[model samples]
Target: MISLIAALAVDRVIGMENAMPWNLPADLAWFKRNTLNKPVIMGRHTWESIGRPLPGRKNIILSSQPGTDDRVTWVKSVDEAIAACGDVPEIMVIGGGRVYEQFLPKAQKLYLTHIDAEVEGDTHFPDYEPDDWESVFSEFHDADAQNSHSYCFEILERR
Candidate 1:
């Protein structure tokens, strides 16, 4: 199975000028907790933002151009990325907008952090019908000093 994880605003806003629009450490912690030790697939832009492969996971980057680093495997397409995962039970797709759009249809699970407020952003998460998914987990957290907006962590499995 393949899972996609992301933190987005109420309007589905994901990125602003190729960077994240909000600061939510809890969301980041939630991401690391779930994605650690799994094979993580992400677009080049997402990789560039991080600048290096994440520790404790197999980092598979989707890029048309070849990568120079030996630490992370750069794949040309979605098929190649998944193929690289081999027999892994679940592959995590961490993204920029384009990567999420490419994987959404094929993904079996979604680990989403739904932010309460909408903000100006240039990129957006791909749309999906709520009816197609069953929420197996959900936890909400109010905005605090570290986080800018209220958010909910949800794990929705496709039906």
Candidate 2:
């Protein structure tokens, strides 16, 4: 199965200037725990933002252009990206806007951090009907000293 994991605002705004605007330790921890050891598929921009391949995971970067990189397995299309994941039981789609749009329809599950606040951003999540997906699990977290952000961690599956 393929999974999409991201943190976004009410407006579906994901990032500004190709980087996350807020820093949430809990969210980061959640990401690390879930994504580690899995094949992580991301757009070129998202891969660039991270600077290097994340340790303990196979990094697959989807790009229109491809050359060669030992750290990143480059693919030109969404199908190629998915194919590169091999026989792994699951793959994780980490994103920028374009990547998310490409993978959403193919995703079996979605792990979303729904933030309470909105920020200006060029990239946004795709619009989809609420009836299309079911919220299997959700946990709300209040703003606190360690993490000054209020958000809900939601696990969604196809309805």
Candidate 3:
């Protein structure tokens, strides 16, 4: 299975100049809970944005110039990364804008957070037609005094 994950605010805003725009602790915990033990592939920019390999998972980064960390395996292309995944049941494509666009069409599943507020962003999620996929699960959150935004965590799969 091929899955890609992201957190996008309204207007498809994902990141601003290589950094996330929102602080949603629950969403971060959710991501960690789900992606642990899975091999994850991401573009170099995403890797730089994160600044280090995520612990407890095999890290694959796509770059013309690859990183040298033993904990992460750097590859030159997406195909190379997939080849390196061996026989894993699923490979998670974690991303920055460019990498997300590259994998969006081929993704079998998407785990995303739909933040309700519109925010300025330099990076955006790709536009996709709704009829091609189905929303298999959804969890909604209501923002309170402490939280500034309401959002929905959605799991979508190819139709």
TM-score: which is higher, 1 or 3?
1
What order do you get sorting by lDDT, best first? 1, 2, 3
lDDT of 2 at 64: 88
Q: Please give the distance, in angstroms, between residue 145's alpha carbon in candidate 3 and its true position after superposition.
A: 5.6
lDDT of 1 at 86: 93
The C-alpha local distance difference test score for the whole of candidate 3 amounts to: 0.87
The TM-score, computed over Cα atoms with residue i paired to residue i, of candidate 1 is 0.96
Candidate 1: which stretches are off by over 4 Å?
none
| CA shift of 45, model 1, Å | 0.9
Per-residue CA lDDT of model 2 for 9-103, tens digit only, reads 86999988988888889999999999999999989889888888899999999888864677679889988888999999989999988988888
Could you tell which candidate, 2 or 3, scores higher by lDDT? 2
List candidate 3 segments past 4 Å from native.
Answer: none
Task: Judge candidate 2 at residue 3 and give its lDDT.
Answer: 93
Clash counts per candidate, in order, are 0, 0, 0
TM-scores, in order shown?
0.96, 0.95, 0.94
Report per-prediction Cα RMSD to one decimal: 1.1, 1.1, 1.3
Q: What's the lDDT for residue 8 in model 1?
A: 86
- Segments in model 2 whose C-alpha atoms lie over 4 Å from true places: none
Q: What C-alpha lDDT does candidate 1 achieve relative to the native structure? A: 0.91
